[PDB]
Amino acid sequence: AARDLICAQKFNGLTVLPPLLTDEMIAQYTSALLAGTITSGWTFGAGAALQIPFAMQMAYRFNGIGVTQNVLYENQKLIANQFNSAIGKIQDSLSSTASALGKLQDVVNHNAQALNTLVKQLSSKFGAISSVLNDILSRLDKVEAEVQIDRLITGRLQSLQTYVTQQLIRAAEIRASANLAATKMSECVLGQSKRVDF
Amino acid sequence: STECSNLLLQYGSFCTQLKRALTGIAVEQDKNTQEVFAQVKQIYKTPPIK
Amino acid sequence: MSLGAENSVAYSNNSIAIPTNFTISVTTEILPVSMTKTSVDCTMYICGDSTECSNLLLQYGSFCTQLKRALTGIAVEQDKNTQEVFAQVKQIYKTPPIKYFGGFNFSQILPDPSKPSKRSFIEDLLFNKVTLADAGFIKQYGDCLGDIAARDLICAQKFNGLTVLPPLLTDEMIAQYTSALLAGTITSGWTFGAGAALQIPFAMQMAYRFNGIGVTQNVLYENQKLIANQFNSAIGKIQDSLSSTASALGKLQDVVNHNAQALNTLVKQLSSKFGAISSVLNDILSRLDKVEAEVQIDRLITGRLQSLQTYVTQQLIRAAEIRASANLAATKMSECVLGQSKRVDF
Amino acid sequence: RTQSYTNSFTRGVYYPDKVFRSSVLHSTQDLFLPFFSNVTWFHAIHNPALPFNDGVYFASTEKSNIIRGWIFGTTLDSKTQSLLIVNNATNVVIKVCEFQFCNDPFLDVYANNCTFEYVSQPFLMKNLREFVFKNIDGYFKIYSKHTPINLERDLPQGFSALEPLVDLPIGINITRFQTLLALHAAAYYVGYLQPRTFLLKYNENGTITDAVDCALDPLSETKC
Amino acid sequence: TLKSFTVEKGIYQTSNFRVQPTESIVRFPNITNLCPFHEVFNATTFASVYAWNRKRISNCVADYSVIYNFAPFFAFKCYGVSPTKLNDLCFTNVYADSFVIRGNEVSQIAPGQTGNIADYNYKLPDDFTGCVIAWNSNKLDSKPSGNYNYLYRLFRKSKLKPFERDISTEIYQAGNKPCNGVAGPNCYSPLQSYGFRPTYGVGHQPYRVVVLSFELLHAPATVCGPKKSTNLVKNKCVNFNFNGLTGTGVLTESNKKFLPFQQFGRDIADTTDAVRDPQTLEILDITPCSFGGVSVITPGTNTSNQVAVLYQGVNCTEVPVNVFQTRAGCLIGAEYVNNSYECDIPIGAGICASYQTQSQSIIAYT
């Protein structure tokens, strides 16, 4: 059919590397964390995993936030129904609305447009007579083609340095967000949080 | 292009440090994923009673 | 790659598992705080006492002033990071000469007056294992003038206009701050971080710590000797692990190595032509007339300015990362040492 | 004459410039002899010419000092200018002429269009005499280094850098070359240079002690 | 340095102190012969472009100002150097190539260019450092009956490498049938005459070309221009001139073991670390004279106009272009007291400064 943008990126020396952990490994880690949270509570994050019934674990969780544990044992079916209804509303909202995941889409879109700009910047002349090295090398003699090639080299090197600097700043922002995500993994899933709005 | 490569060789080690910066970013991404997700030491599994 | 060992906890709706014993574990966390302070002047690097190069460099505006301002801001920020992490106590507390704390051995972390720099045993291993690049914070111009053996990298850095500034707080003052925090921790508890230091016996302070984590304080008083022996064994294991394994301190070694490598790259970048006929400036002055040598000097000036700005931008990004790590270390100093934390994995 | 084949054994390194460098790793792109190659062992008991192909590494392990002189050219029948390096016990005589001369047969110890007449000190002198000849930009450069050998088996293991001798700007279109003999036997190795990239190592005394050929194996490319 | 008339309290990096040079040193080899440019530029007959002469100029002193008096040319068109700076610096060897071409082909004598002379008669390298001198020769190399002593080659199997010569004349063949020494069908002699006449146009006139090829300093210098030498002094920051290598620094004795073919020593930053003196065969270390940073420690101008100067990173027994020694350099103008206050102006490794009372003055402390 037509030439893809990824092929035009790959033909000009730009390569995307695969991550070390595949999606199945991330799913295995998530399933292990979920099973340890459900079966053990917060005991698996501080040593050996000790089993506990889930109703008694939820009574422990209510006793953490200042409510006596008889409230759960007298209202267990209502709280189970409320939890199931809330999971159903999350499923319906994720099936209906698609604007919630805009951060990961922005992460994809920025990395797409940076490489697209780096490819498109190769058409620039930077004050030379042409943007093609073969036309310059065939049209002029040695000294003039050396001058035009030097101008093109300076322009392309400046654009590549700009791309690397912007990638470094974006990587610092991504590392800050990943540190926050690791803290929320350690404090919300592996335990119970006393911090307000955390 | 051989002439372009010969003229690019006179600009020093700009591409070496660009390559080093990109390699550092690439290692940092996998470090971020390992720090976030690989927090548990054993792979617990659900018993068949749901 | 293997993610981990397969496990299957026996869940049931009427079964629970309760521990009957405990272990006291001591772990080690290493956090960078500051990095190397550097100072670069443009005239020695770009020109090297050439009057024509300086006169052509004056036409490029105030690039060097803002590069100098950025480097000075980084240098001030490093001292601010060290002060904001370590100088958290208001008074220099000292441990009493009677070294009994309920049977807990603190001899390997408390300082000793035998050596001149009053550092502990573990602090001596941590200073010995992290090798230094031996930068220009020690004066070496008398050594650089005297040509002995072969030319050093530090002398080539210094002769081209790159200079490393010493930190404001010496290692003895950092050790004094650490000893004051340690003495206030082991003789007062968490009271010295919230006002005046109120004394408390160490067994009763540890019983308060046991009440913090949801264990009744009679468990400590019925098992005091076992807990003290476990603490001493864990401290000895930390000592043996620091004596044997040398790969634990890679973060501070990376901090040293990056700041050495950036200056080495900046020195090596002076051998490039950048499209001119020679990297040597005096050959350009002698071999040509005014206009052509001015053209070649302009090419060299442009290339050296891009190399210097690349170095300054990389240093600014590294300084931001180091400042984030220092803020984390200051939070961990305020919450782990000066109190007891309920946050999981913190 | 009898031919054979043997390994180069990381041998054939020379100083690329007349600049003193100490305790530094230097990268040089020049016509070098690649590592672990096959040089050709010629046993001269007996003779067609040998092709001069972008540089020649010459070696000789002979104690009796028989081998002497060289001829350079492209067709060698007075239809071209030919370089003639003739050595003896006193001087060397280097000349470029049409050169229908001869010293190969048994005429020994029991002109035309001449361009230059360079005479100087002699070149040659359990010892190995290593020589490198090259022709770049009309300039003929000769490198040499003599090294004693203990066990006369083959080319030795180790490094011995070659020092420059003279930089003759005469010698045009060298394609084939020839080597003399001497009788009252002769054994020499011939290797061919190649445009490779090397990474030279200098010690604290300024002597080349180690080198890495960047296009030999991927480990050496990683080192370079 | 702050672009303001009022400064605040703190420490500011202002400038750098440099030791200025006192004397000058010129070191040239002791050569008294004169280079024979008159034999090159003033000749009765010049060779053809296919058989151009090459003359080696060595072991003499070259004066380039007499070249204008020798021949009436317009442009001293040089490539790697300038014509006005040829008498200061110097080289190893100079080669002069002389030939006669047509006025159309004078532009072909340039590095990196193809044509007829540049491909089959005389090819210049891409790294050519030298000057091309060409002038008209209508009065000596032109006859009304035509000239046949000047030959050029236009037929060859391959392009010529730089600085190569071709003397042999064979019958050129551009077909499958061999010539066998017979100039018949598809057989051409490669040399044909220029045929110079005085009635031709200005672009067809005979031109005498002299190409001076300089090679840079790698060997000991054998040809050097007119410049008097100066006695060598050591252990002083001076200006040196070693065979055209200018610079500023301190020359000391060295224990570097130079090999006998080496005349220079370079550094990681591509600068000359050591040099060999051309008069006496000795090795000299080149190091720059003393420098360092200067920091000015002041309170505000609303308080006082007194300052203290910190000379960064020096052991100040070599100060000039109260004295207290710190680890960040040494402090001049502040009195060190044996007290301990809070830090006001941070200087270095545990040393601060303040404006106190015990007559107001600037003190330094731990």
Ligand SMILES: *[C@@H]1O[C@H](CO)[C@@H](O[C@@H]2O[C@H](CO)[C@@H](O)[C@H](O)[C@H]2NC(C)=O)[C@H](O)[C@H]1NC(C)=O
């Ligand atoms: C709890 O664990 C400790 C070790 O962590 C046990 O102490 C050991 O007990 C055995 C059995 O007598 C002794 O041989 C060891 O010397 C003890 N080790 C020490 C004191 O460090 C202790 O017995 C355990 N408690 C229970 C109730 O099982």
Ligand SMILES: *[C@@H]1O[C@H](CO)[C@@H](O)[C@H](O)[C@H]1NC(C)=O
């Ligand atoms: C509790 O567990 C047992 C066996 O694990 C099962 O038979 C029983 O149905 C469970 N109780 C309820 C209310 O489902």
Ligand SMILES: *[C@@H]1O[C@H](CO)[C@@H](O)[C@H](O)[C@H]1NC(C)=O
């Ligand atoms: C433990 O404390 C005693 C003092 O009672 C001391 O002698 C000993 O050295 C300490 N242990 C270690 C390993 O330092």
Ligand SMILES: *[C@@H]1O[C@H](CO)[C@@H](O)[C@H](O)[C@H]1NC(C)=O
């Ligand atoms: C060198 O060439 C000879 C000629 O056949 C060959 O036998 C020998 O294996 C070669 N050496 C190598 C490939 O190392």
Ligand SMILES: *[C@@H]1O[C@H](CO)[C@@H](O)[C@H](O)[C@H]1NC(C)=O
């Ligand atoms: C340099 O030369 C000295 C002088 O003999 C010698 O002692 C030293 O070992 C040499 N260094 C080397 C070979 O690395």
Ligand SMILES: *[C@@H]1O[C@H](CO)[C@@H](O)[C@H](O)[C@H]1NC(C)=O
């Ligand atoms: C130049 O001077 C050196 C040492 O002063 C001396 O050995 C040499 O003979 C001199 N050369 C001439 C040509 O005078």
Ligand SMILES: *[C@@H]1O[C@H](CO)[C@@H](O)[C@H](O)[C@H]1NC(C)=O
């Ligand atoms: C060239 O040399 C001849 C012979 O010495 C002389 O007569 C003539 O004047 C010289 N030409 C110039 C311009 O000096």
Ligand SMILES: *[C@@H]1O[C@H](CO)[C@@H](O)[C@H](O)[C@H]1NC(C)=O
């Ligand atoms: C260098 O400084 C130290 C420390 O003040 C001093 O002991 C030494 O004498 C100084 N060196 C000189 C003055 O040459």
